[PDB]
């Protein structure tokens, strides 16, 4: 079993940044691959980054060049740096976790951004 914690969601204005982070708890050791995804009301998950334990990631288009996931293995921690946020990226923000042999899937409990000016 692995449990997925997330933090660093909220309020912040356009053109600002964020950090989420999502911690990693129980049988970490047996993760293969961490990912970040977003759903705003009435629609589907977007996803938006994906990275290995290698360090290899991949990205959606509609946030490359903005969005950077990393992870610190030490800390089972995945990170995604979510830079010139725009009033589109509101949503709620999740944080997936493939393990034991990519065959299984756990997810976190999600955390709002809200991009406004107020
Ligand atoms: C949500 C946290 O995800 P991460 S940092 O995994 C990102 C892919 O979890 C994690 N923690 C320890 N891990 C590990 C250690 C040794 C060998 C293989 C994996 N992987
Ligand atoms: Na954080």
């Known amino acids: 079993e692995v449990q997925l914690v997330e933090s660093g969601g909220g309020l912040v204005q356009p053109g600002g940044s964020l950090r989420l982070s999502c911690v990693g708890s129980?049988?970490?050791?047996?993760?293969?691959?961490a990912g970040w995804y977003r759903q705003a009301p009435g629609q589907e998950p977007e996803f938006l980054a994906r990275?290995?334990?290698?360090?290899?990631?991949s990205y959606a288009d509609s946030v490359k060049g903005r969005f950077t996931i990393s992870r610190d293995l030490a800390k089972s921690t995945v990170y995604l740096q979510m830079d010139y946020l725009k009033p589109e990226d509101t949503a709620v923000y999740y944080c997936?976790?493939?393990?034991?042999?990519?065959?299984?899937?756990?997810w976190g409990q999600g955390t709002q951004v809200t991009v406004s000016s107020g």
């Open positions: 997936n976790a493939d393990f034991d042999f990519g065959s299984r899937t756990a």
């Open positions: 990275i290995t334990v290698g360090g290899t990631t």
């Open positions: 129980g049988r970490v050791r047996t993760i293969n691959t």
